[PDB]
Design a protein around this ligand. Structure first.
Ligand SMILES: NC(=O)C1=CN([C@@H]2O[C@H](COP(=O)(O)OP(=O)(O)OC[C@H]3O[C@@H](n4cnc5c(N)ncnc54)[C@H](OP(=O)(O)O)[C@@H]3O)[C@@H](O)[C@H]2O)C=CC1
Ligand SMILES: NC(=O)C1=CN([C@@H]2O[C@H](COP(=O)(O)OP(=O)(O)OC[C@H]3O[C@@H](n4cnc5c(N)ncnc54)[C@H](OP(=O)(O)O)[C@@H]3O)[C@@H](O)[C@H]2O)C=CC1
Ligand SMILES: CN(Cc1cnc2nc(N)nc(N)c2n1)c1ccc(C(=O)N[C@@H](CCC(=O)O)C(=O)O)cc1
Ligand SMILES: CN(Cc1cnc2nc(N)nc(N)c2n1)c1ccc(C(=O)N[C@@H](CCC(=O)O)C(=O)O)cc1
Ligand SMILES: Nc1nc2[nH]cc(Cc3ccc(C(=O)Nc4cc(C(=O)O)ccc4C(=O)O)cc3)c2c(=O)[nH]1
Ligand SMILES: Nc1nc2[nH]cc(Cc3ccc(C(=O)Nc4cc(C(=O)O)ccc4C(=O)O)cc3)c2c(=O)[nH]1
Ligand SMILES: O=c1[nH]c(=O)n([C@H]2C[C@H](O)[C@@H](COP(=O)(O)O)O2)cc1F
Ligand SMILES: O=c1[nH]c(=O)n([C@H]2C[C@H](O)[C@@H](COP(=O)(O)O)O2)cc1F
Lengths: 506, 506
């Protein structure tokens, strides 16, 4: 009685694995993963058995794999005894004799075609599943991986990796069938009610924990957002705010995202990337005219740019969508005497973005690459105080650009995905203009809150198992950071779950 | 063969447990912990045995404990059979008969005096140790807990709790005698070198992990600092900076600290708390004169206030210790035209601190309680740009004041403990002025680095097992936040390891 694992690489949606007798992709790292996982063994005097169909045996050139015994399931291939590393069996059930006799086999790997996977799961011989999800779906398939039965549960999901602009994941599925520390902590929590800090940050209940079966393998960095969602649902205090829509809020959280091998755009919900880019390039250009965003069919600043909202916050003198000195005005004209959105501020104010770029490419090991938007003097003139307040940038020894962001208030339903994608795109732009590669993105959140009219929606978003991140590439290298256009961005391999409508609280 | 656990409450240093036949403290929560841990049982048809000496049996009033069988070790007490909840044994070895016969006993708890603990450990009958460390040491003891033998290792250390201004801990010691997920992650790390984000944040090696035996029980929040120290030692990239002393640096980290039941002042090193307080009140008063700190025998700002350092950074015109518009000038006079440290700036600039207090006590549920020190216009005039750049404050539904701090650059050897204690004291001051209780302190670090001249020292600090946090109390309620004086602070139960000299990099 030894272990049996199905090793497979399938597409993310349709679960296709092959086309015309070959793989529908060329990912060398996946072959390396196959080689390393099939050579995994605890005994040096034992080999691992790789069961495969005849057509798969043809796909590998009918040659043996080193340090492994290949078992071909075929009703026509002659049971050749010349090659000791390859043996042929007439059916799959008879091939499962390594459990009974043949003690020189330690682990068994089912890695054949659809005709092998299907009746290896049907006969219930499989204990584990090493699945490699690949983000290709607009191509042609003819061989698919069967839907994983409900008897299996996912226990691990790696981060998203990139190869030839193709995104891919790694997942493990298992066949589901020291307590003293836990008991002492539970007793100490029963004693001190909310005096033990652990009770103020309770672990989220399973009913609001996205993919609860993945406990110790939450490597995919979209979990940095979903687990924050769950923590707010679990420990969020019901509080009122400036809007009539109350929220559930907690304080002091963080999220990490990788940008070397992927792009942190959420897959559990289709995110409007064009509006994000237009807002970001609007910031970079130094503009505060909301009509310029509305003309480009982007209405995220319409709620805070209506005449009624401006007269209500005491800015009735201001023009329709003249938002005042906000994001992008403090970036390019910090401490500049603001008049209207039509004046020419070229020259006035401290151009933080230009100095940031100059410092990033002239003195990388510096610790002062800081872009601030919090200006106490101009706060009263703002239509909305800065939410993403502070940002710091960092150059690694291998010429990568990482970014930290401190955000005073985060609306996890609408503001958070936009902030993640926006600062990722900004880091990528800064890295290209300065000549670096994108690094990591850390977002530090003060007041992380969920509006109460989003509870039905966000819960739905927590019911969707995450898919690998897409890739974001630039079609041309620009000379100045302001020269970016929407046509320059290529979004590759983004297959998210359907969009989830949520109303903005004005 | 069942489990045996020594339950004891001892002082942190001398390990005293009693005085003149009674306890040297009255901590009700510890008695509740005793009651809950000795009644912990998996079988309802079984009782737990509590072994104690005769003098301890006298200390509990010679009355039985509910749902438990008390075993008194005494050579004089008559073996009375009237009370079924109390039994007398002549020696400790004969009392260890519940292992052989008497299957109605599930767990055994050694809870006697020094004379029982010593030869319960000497005879090696003890499997576990539930130790309650109490931070009282300037009192009189007459009964001590023996030094825990090397066969035991700590596996858990709770957070610091407070009762009657007394700090205390909870620790567990044990007698030392799914792998697929780990193997898959190791293989994925072998494939992608530093492309897998996990490899850029490797888990610290045991040789640089403070108290490595405590794996799953690092609850004490001084570990939030020691684990960051270890992570910098593990993943720190060797980088140069403005000073000749190079560092090992990483980017994007955080630390959490509780302030409801303790005070985050490091115990692994004696920290000069008075200098921290004097710097903080110097900030609050709006001062930029380094001579005011030097006159109070505080020399932390002498390196950045020397004539040579000012002439080197291009401020040779400036006076001796005139540091320029820095912390506390941006707090009280933001965007204020700075001249020298002798002028009267009362009135000019935006008083961020006053508005902060006003917003904290007039509009608590607000999300804009923000104090910034990063001013791009005044950066050139500063002797040293702000390290603790931004701070946000938050009022919970139970009227507690929590604080987030973003620090762009952190010197984990000298700057970090000072920053932790300083912002803790500042949060407590704001809480008293606004009428709240202290909450939590979250510190977010951008460039967390360790100077190479501190490597010998900090490693030493990582060899010291943490002791419970102290308490910090105020002797009087002040009318204005600037009225605090050093004589108003009482530091209770601070018993740190000896101080570790480390040179500041100018
Ligand atoms: N992405 C991935 O992880 C993998 C993808 N693939 C791809 O899949 C494609 C090929 O797979 P597939 O089309 O399913 O073909 P198979 O690899 O499953 O091989 C099928 C052959 O195996 C024999 N066989 C199958 N079932 C039985 C049975 N119940 N009893 C006896 N013999 C049996 C038959 O051989 P015979 O006719 O001689 O009797 C049959 O022709 C290729 O593109 C390949 O590259 C393959 C492996 C892994
Ligand atoms: N902080 C804490 O967790 C605890 C503190 N304490 C404190 O400690 C103090 C008391 O402890 P302590 O001074 O050590 O006294 P003990 O509680 O250990 O009791 C000692 C008695 O136990 C009997 N005894 C001990 N060893 C033997 C032996 N080898 N053979 C036969 N009989 C033995 C003797 O009784 P006899 O003379 O009758 O033969 C002896 O006088 C008190 O202040 C108490 O409150 C007590 C428990 C817990
Ligand atoms: C056609 N085929 C089937 C195949 C391909 N990709 C897969 N990918 C996955 N994730 N799982 C599978 N079962 C799988 N099977 C192949 C093709 C090549 C090799 C192969 O040459 N493996 C080398 C790997 C060498 C390398 O590139 O470093 C080895 O050492 O095993 C294996 C199976
Ligand atoms: C003198 N003595 C010995 C004593 C006291 N404190 C300790 N504290 C600790 N952490 N560990 C011990 N072994 C210990 N032993 C005592 C004194 C009172 C009770 C007691 O009354 N316990 C009640 C507690 C009831 C309560 O106040 O909630 C119980 O239900 O067990 C026990 C032991
Ligand atoms: N309170 C409050 N004030 C705010 N002021 C400015 C913002 C920034 C901001 C971000 C996003 C939106 C939005 O509506 N985003 C979308 C979400 C989805 C989705 O989730 O499926 C689909 C489409 C869109 C879209 O607009 O294309 C609107 C504003 C903001 C805020 O976030 N909160
Ligand atoms: N690079 C660089 N520039 C800096 N400019 C200003 C600072 C702030 C600052 C904090 C602390 C000290 C110090 O020396 N602190 C002590 C530490 C210990 C100890 O923990 O052993 C014991 C005593 C003292 C003490 O002075 O009483 C000196 C400056 C600073 C910095 O931190 N780094
Ligand atoms: O990028 C943004 N992210 C974000 O989360 N908000 C939301 C947070 C909050 O719901 C609202 C501001 O409310 P307040 O000003 O009171 O913090 O804006 C706004 C942005 F522009
Ligand atoms: O409160 C402080 N905290 C702190 O960590 N530093 C350290 C961080 C760094 O070692 C140095 C700042 O120099 P630079 O900004 O050039 O990195 O001072 C200084 C303070 F005043």
């Amino acid at each position: 009685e030894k272990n049996v694992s199905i090793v497979v690489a399938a597409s993310v949606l349709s679960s296709g694995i092959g086309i015309n007798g070959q793989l529908p992709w060329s990912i060398s790292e996946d072959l390396k993963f196959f080689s390393k996982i099939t050579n995994n063994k605890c005994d040096s005097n034992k080999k691992n058995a790789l069961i495969m169909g005849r057509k798969t045996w043809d796909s590998i050139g009918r040659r043996p794999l080193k340090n492994r015994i290949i078992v071909v399931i075929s009703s026509s291939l002659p049971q050749d005894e010349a090659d000791p590393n390859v043996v042929v069996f007439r059916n799959l059930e008879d091939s499962i004799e390594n459990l009974m006799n043949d003690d020189s086999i330690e682990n068994i790997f089912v890695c054949g075609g659809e005709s092998i996977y299907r009746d290896a799961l049907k006969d219930n011989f499989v204990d584990r599943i090493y699945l490699t999800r690949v983000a290709l779906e607009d191509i042609e398939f003819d061989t698919y991986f069967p839907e994983i039965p409900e008897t299996f549960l996912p226990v691990y999901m790696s981060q998203t990796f990139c190869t030839k602009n193709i995104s891919y994941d790694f997942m493990i599925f298992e066949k589901q069938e020291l307590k003293s520390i836990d008991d002492t902590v539970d007793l100490l929590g029963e004693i001190f009610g909310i005096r033990k800090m652990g009770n103020r940050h309770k672990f989220p209940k399973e009913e609001i924990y996205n993919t609860p079966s993945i406990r110790f393998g939450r490597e995919h960095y979209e979990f940095q957002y979903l687990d924050l969602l769950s923590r707010v649902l679990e420990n969020g205090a019901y509080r009122e705010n400036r809007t009539g829509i109350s929220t559930y809020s907690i304080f002091g959280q963080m999220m990490r995202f990788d940008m070397r091998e992927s792009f942190p755009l959420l897959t559990t919900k289709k995110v409007a990337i064009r509006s994000i880019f237009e807002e970001l390039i609007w910031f970079i250009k130094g503009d505060t005219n909301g009509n310029h965003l509305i003309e480009k069919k982007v209405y995220i600043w319409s709620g805070n740019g209506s005449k009624e909202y401006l007269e209500r916050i005491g800015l009735g003198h201001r023009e329709e969508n003249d938002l005042g000195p906000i994001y992008g005005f403090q970036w390019r004209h910090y401490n500049g005497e603001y008049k209207t959105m039509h004046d020419d501020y070229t020259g006035v104010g401290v151009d933080q973005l230009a100095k940031l770029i100059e410092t990033l490419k002239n003195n990388p090991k510096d610790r002062r690459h800081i872009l601030t938007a919090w200006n106490p003097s101009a706060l009263s003139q703002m239509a909305l105080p800065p939410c993403h307040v502070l940002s710091q940038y960092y150059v690694t020894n291998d010429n990568c650009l990482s970014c930290n962001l401190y955000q005073r208030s985060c609306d996890l339903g609408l503001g958070s995905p936009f902030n993640i994608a926006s600062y990722a795109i900004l880091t990528m732009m800064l890295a290209q203009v300065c000549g670096y590669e994108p690094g990591e993105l850390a977002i530090f959140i003060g007041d992380a809150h969920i509006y109460e009219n989003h509870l039905t929606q966000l819960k739905e978003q927590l019911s969707r198992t995450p898919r690998p991140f897409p890739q974001l590439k630039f079609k041309r290298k620009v000379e100045n950071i302001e020269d970016f256009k929407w046509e320059d961005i290529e979004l590759i391999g983004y297959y998210p779950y359907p969009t989830i409508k949520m109303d903005m609280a004005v």
